[PDB]
Design a protein around this ligand. Structure first.
Ligand SMILES: NCCc1cc(Br)cc(C#Cc2cccc(C#Cc3cc(Br)cc(CCN)c3)c2)c1
Ligand SMILES: NCCc1cc(Br)cc(C#Cc2cccc(C#Cc3cc(Br)cc(CCN)c3)c2)c1
Lengths: 213, 214
């Protein structure tokens, strides 16, 4: 069973150029590919889908704004929506809308969809270390008590199934400081397919790799 | 020219290679050792600064005993040897030989060779965090001064060139809790060749793939 899939969605800008169009056309087709992947995962019983907006190449605030009009429909589809990443300097109106959308869907029991916005795997670790360091300073924690289990409880997604499978589209063979801690034991699947062309047969191919493993 | 300063290798496939031969595991480990010597020599000869090796089969303390017999040869090839991993419960005779071997070769100016022994990427992060937490408890460090650059200065190999390329032999596509923090920007190169068969032309092929893809 593949329970939690993460995807680095690369290739939108490259796709646009290949189609003889401006960058925005690649964004729009990438967004259609997000909808199709989220639909596929919810239909195939995947528990959690984590999507990293990234291009080989403020644009992150725009990307999250564009999701705002999809929330009513995610909710109807029993999807729990979370944004992961450092949103603490987004505009306050967008922060409040993120907070409202998360709270709206927080009770849902279908697919959990994590959208990584201004996220980095080293950042994620550092935010968990800062928390532990506040506890040490307060005298609530001994340095020698800090262990893997404890750090784990302070990194993103710790309440969800372990990441089983990471897919990167677009042809590069790197993690690019997406999840680090969380991918210790995950299957890594690289495809040259550009994100806007990545479809249900491509997702199924990746799921086969994992099942062969 | 290839552009790689630090290569790290997950050396998988020794058990499979011996099973293909109708031989027991020991024979794959012996062939895997011959392939280590060959890789270390190829890296030293091709301008790599650092090579970091993780012995894995999809026994530990015995791997490191085995390495002890190679230390005089590494020294003679101007290799600087370091062990990375939690060797604190290896007992004292082993720990001491480890210490003497690092001391002997620390002055060497050729390749730096890091051998993982009882190493995990999560463990490595946690040890760094514990050093930062001691500094907080001494009153020396504020939690909000802790940033990536600072945690970077506390993980294994922080003083060496960043890892540019990770090779995993043996056909599995996974990191298996070998270096996490350090591989955030590294090229990942997976090959179905089994470790004992991975030779200079395969190593050349990985470096040239990194040069072309970077
Ligand atoms: N006019 C395009 C505006 C735009 C720009 C950019 Br950039 C991004 C988007 C977007 C999006 C999006 C992001 C996350 C999730 C989804 C979804 C979805 C979804 C999930 C399920 Br389950 C079911 C449905 C209904 C259609 N099958 C839709 C859609 C939209
Ligand atoms: N032959 C079986 C004994 C054995 C068993 C096991 Br398990 C492991 C080993 C090992 C090893 C090891 C570990 C780290 C480095 C090396 C090496 C080397 C080396 C490097 C250069 Br440069 C040159 C040479 C020999 C070239 N004259 C040799 C060898 C050795």
């Amino acid at each position: 069973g593949c329970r939690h899939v993460a995807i680095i969605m690369d290739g939108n800008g490259r796709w646009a150029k290949k189609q003889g169009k401006i960058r925005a056309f690649g964004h729009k087709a990438g967004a259609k590919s997000v909808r199709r992947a989220v639909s596929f995962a919810a239909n195939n019983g995947i528990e959690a889908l984590t999507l990293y907006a990234f291009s080989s190449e403020a644009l992150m605030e725009l990307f999250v704004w564009a999701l705002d009009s999809e929330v009513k429909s995610l909710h109807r589809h029993n999807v729990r929506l979370r944004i992961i990443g450092d949103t603490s300097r987004f505009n306050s109106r967008l922060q409040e809308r993120i907070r409202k959308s998360e709270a709206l869907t927080a009770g849902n029991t279908g697919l959990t969809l994590n959208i990584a916005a201004n996220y980095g795997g080293r950042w994620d670790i550092v935010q968990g270390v800062r928390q532990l360091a506040e506890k040490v300073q307060q005298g609530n924690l001994q340095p020698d008590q800090i262990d893997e289990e404890m750090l784990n409880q302070h990194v993103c997604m710790h309440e969800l199934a372990p990441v089983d499978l990471v897919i990167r589209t677009g042809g590069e063979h790197r993690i690019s400081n997406f999840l680090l801690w969380q991918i210790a034991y995950a299957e890594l699947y690289f495809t040259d397919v550009l994100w806007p062309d990545f479809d249900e047969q491509d997702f199924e191919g990746a799921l086969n790799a994992f099942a062969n493993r």
